[PDB]
Design an enzyme around this catalytic site. Structure first.
Site, PDB file in Angstrom:
ATOM      1  N   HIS A  80       9.518  23.989  49.416  1.00  0.00           N
ATOM      2  CA  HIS A  80      10.823  24.638  48.319  1.00  0.00           C
ATOM      3  C   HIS A  80      11.057  26.074  48.858  1.00  0.00           C
ATOM      4  O   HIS A  80      12.073  26.338  48.339  1.00  0.00           O
ATOM      5  CB  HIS A  80      10.353  24.332  47.165  1.00  0.00           C
ATOM      6  CG  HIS A  80       9.607  25.358  46.345  1.00  0.00           C
ATOM      7  ND1 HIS A  80       8.007  25.249  46.274  1.00  0.00           N
ATOM      8  CD2 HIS A  80       9.775  26.800  46.129  1.00  0.00           C
ATOM      9  CE1 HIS A  80       7.373  26.285  45.585  1.00  0.00           C
ATOM     10  NE2 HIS A  80       8.652  27.242  45.511  1.00  0.00           N
ATOM     11  N   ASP A 126       5.374  19.056  48.753  1.00  0.00           N
ATOM     12  CA  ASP A 126       6.151  20.420  48.908  1.00  0.00           C
ATOM     13  C   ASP A 126       4.869  21.246  50.058  1.00  0.00           C
ATOM     14  O   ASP A 126       4.147  22.173  49.681  1.00  0.00           O
ATOM     15  CB  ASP A 126       5.650  21.204  47.433  1.00  0.00           C
ATOM     16  CG  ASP A 126       6.359  22.518  47.589  1.00  0.00           C
ATOM     17  OD1 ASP A 126       6.991  22.791  48.341  1.00  0.00           O
ATOM     18  OD2 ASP A 126       6.485  23.425  46.481  1.00  0.00           O
ATOM     19  N   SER A 132       4.138  31.082  45.783  1.00  0.00           N
ATOM     20  CA  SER A 132       4.558  29.764  46.170  1.00  0.00           C
ATOM     21  C   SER A 132       4.213  29.967  47.833  1.00  0.00           C
ATOM     22  O   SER A 132       4.553  30.888  48.357  1.00  0.00           O
ATOM     23  CB  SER A 132       5.984  29.594  46.154  1.00  0.00           C
ATOM     24  OG  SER A 132       6.362  29.144  44.760  1.00  0.00           O
ATOM     25  N   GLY A 133       3.519  28.848  48.192  1.00  0.00           N
ATOM     26  CA  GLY A 133       3.240  28.947  49.804  1.00  0.00           C
ATOM     27  C   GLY A 133       1.910  29.354  50.061  1.00  0.00           C
ATOM     28  O   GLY A 133       1.363  28.938  51.065  1.00  0.00           O
TER      29      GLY A 133
HETATM   30  N1  LIG Z   1       2.984  28.661  36.625  1.00  0.00           N
HETATM   31  C1  LIG Z   1       2.853  28.319  38.115  1.00  0.00           C
HETATM   32  N2  LIG Z   1       1.527  28.819  38.610  1.00  0.00           N
HETATM   33  C2  LIG Z   1       4.023  28.808  39.024  1.00  0.00           C
HETATM   34  C3  LIG Z   1       5.308  29.060  38.699  1.00  0.00           C
HETATM   35  C4  LIG Z   1       6.286  29.237  39.731  1.00  0.00           C
HETATM   36  C5  LIG Z   1       6.075  28.964  40.874  1.00  0.00           C
HETATM   37  N3  LIG Z   1       7.168  29.373  41.932  1.00  0.00           N
HETATM   38  C6  LIG Z   1       4.823  28.491  41.429  1.00  0.00           C
HETATM   39  C7  LIG Z   1       4.013  28.503  40.569  1.00  0.00           C
END
Ligand SMILES: NC(=[NH2+])c1ccc(N)cc1
Ligand SMILES: *[C@@H]1O[C@H](CO[C@H]2O[C@@H](C)[C@@H](O)[C@@H](O)[C@@H]2O)[C@@H](O[C@@H]2O[C@H](CO)[C@@H](O[C@@H]3O[C@H](CO[C@H]4O[C@@H](CO)[C@@H](O)[C@H](O)[C@@H]4O)[C@@H](O)[C@H](O)[C@@H]3O)[C@H](O)[C@H]2NC(C)=O)[C@H](O)[C@H]1NC(C)=O
Ligand SMILES: NC(=[NH2+])c1ccc(N)cc1
Lengths: 260, 14
Positions: free
Chosen positions: A47, A101, A199-200
Site C-alpha cells: 500500500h 499487503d 508501514s512496510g
Molecule cells: N494503528 C496501526 N498500528 C497503524 C495505523 C496506520 C498505519 N499506516 C499502520 C498501522
C-alpha cells in the site's frame, strides 16, 4: 510509533527508510519503512505505493538512526542512499481489504553491509504463523502521536505483544477484517503501537533462542493508532515465503533463514 | 558479498 523509545544507533540494521523524493526541489520525506534482505532487495508494504508508483518517486536510506525531514542533501557515511530499480507488488494485493499487503523493492546499486546495515531473517518454511503468547518488537520512523504533523526524526522502537487472530478479528475488535495471512500485535488497551510512516517496516520476534531476530510481520494497517482494541495489523511474512522466493530465488531466502 | 552471513543480528558494530 506511539509510546515507544528511541532506538540505539545500530539496533536494527535492517531498517530502511523509504522516502518520497519531490523532484522539483530534490527534497526527501520519510514515508514508509522496509526491511533489508540482501544487497539488492528489501521487503515492505504494497500500500505504500498506491500513489507513488514510479521508481523515480523514491530514495532508499540505509544505516540511519535519524532522518531529516525535507532535506535536499545526500546522506553521510556511514549511512547509504540508493535508488529503486524495481517495485514488485504482490499480484493479489487489494487496497480495499488490504489483502496481501506486501511488496519487494530491488535496490540499485547494491547496498554494502557493515556495522549499521545488515539483513534481517525470514521465518523458516516450517515455522507456521507466529504463536501467542510472545513479546516482539516493532521499529520505525512513523508518527509519534496519532495526530502528528510529521514522521519522527529519530528511529523508534517498541515491544508489542502478539494478539491471537481470533481475538483480533472479534466483534468488538476488528470484527471480521483480519485475514489468516495477517498477524496482529499490540495491547488490548493500546497506548503503544505502530502508526502512519511505520508501514512496510518489521514486526520482529527473537527466535528461540538464538540471538537473532526474525521479521515475522510487515506493518500494514490499523484503525487510528494506539487505540484500545485496535492493534497493529501486520502481513505475516511466513505466508509469503514461496512468493518471496519466486521473485528473489530460494537461495537468497535460505541465506536469511536461521539454521535448521 | 558483505550482506551474506548470519541474518537478524543487531549491533553489528560490537
Ligand atoms: N494503528 C496501526 N498500528 C497503524 C495505523 C496506520 C498505519 N499506516 C499502520 C498501522
Ligand atoms: C474474521 O472474521 C471474518 C468474518 O466473520 C465476520 O462476519 C463479519 C461480517 C463480522 O460481522 C464479524 O461477525 C465476523 O468477524 C471471516 O470472514 C469469512 O471468511 C471466510 C474464509 O475466507 C469466507 O467464507 C467465504 O466463502 C468462500 C469460501 O469458499 C471457499 O473456501 C472453502 C472453505 O474454506 C470451500 O468450502 C469453498 O467452496 C471455497 O473453496 C470464499 O470464496 C470467500 O473468501 C470466503 O471465504 C468469507 O469470506 C468470510 N465471511 C464473512 C461474513 O465475511 C474471516 O475469515 C475471519 N478471519 C480469520 C483469520 O479467521
Ligand atoms: N533504477 C534506476 N535506473 C534509477 C531510478 C531512479 C532514478 N531517478 C534514476 C535511476
Amino acid at each position: 510509533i506511539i509510546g515507544g523509545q528511541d532506538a540505539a544507533h545500530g539496533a536494527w540494521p535492517w531498517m530502511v527508510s523509504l522516502q518520497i523524493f519531490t523532484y522539483h526541489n530534490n527534497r526527501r520525506y520519510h514515508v514508509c519503512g522496509g526491511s533489508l534482505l540482501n544487497s539488492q532487495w528489501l521487503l515492505t508494504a504494497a500500500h505504500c505505493f498506491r500513489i507513488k508508483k514510479k521508481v523515480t518517486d523514491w530514495r532508499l536510506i540505509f544505516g540511519a538512526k535519524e532522518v531529516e525531514w525535507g532535506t535536499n542533501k545526500p546522506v553521510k557515511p556511514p549511512l547509504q542512499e540508493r535508488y529503486v530499480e524495481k517495485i514488485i507488488i504482490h499480484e493479489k494485493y487489494s487496497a480495499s481489504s488490504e489483502a496481501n499487503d506486501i511488496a519487494l523493492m530491488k535496490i540499485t546499486p547494491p547496498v554494502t553491509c557493515g556495522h549499521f546495515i545488515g539483513p534481517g531473517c525470514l521465518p523458516q518454511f516450517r515455522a507456521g504463523p507466529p504463536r501467542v503468547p510472545q513479546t516482539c518488537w516493532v521499529a520505525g520512523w512513523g508518527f509519534l502521536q496519532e495526530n502528528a504533523r510529521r514522521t519522527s526524526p529519530m528511529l523508534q522502537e517498541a515491544r508489542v505483544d502478539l494478539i491471537d487472530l481470533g481475538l483480533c478479528n472479534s466483534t468488538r475488535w476488528y470484527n471480521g477484517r483480519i485475514r489468516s495471512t495477517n498477524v496482529c500485535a499490540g495491547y488490548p488497551e493500546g497506548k503503544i503501537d505502530t502508526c502512519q510512516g511505520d508501514s512496510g517496516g518489521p514486526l520482529m520476534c527473537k527466535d528461540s533462542a538464538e540471538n537473532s531476530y526474525v521479521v515475522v510481520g510487515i506493518t500494514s494497517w490499523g484503525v487510528g493508532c494506539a487505540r484500545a482494541k485496535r492493534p497493529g495489523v501486520y502481513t505475516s511474512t511466513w505466508s509469503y515465503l514461496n512468493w518471496i522466493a519466486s521473485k528473489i530465488g530460494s537461495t537468497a531466502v535460505h541465506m536469511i533463514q536461521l539454521p535448521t | 558479498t558483505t550482506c551474506d552471513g548470519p541474518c537478524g543480528v543487531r549491533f553489528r558494530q560490537n
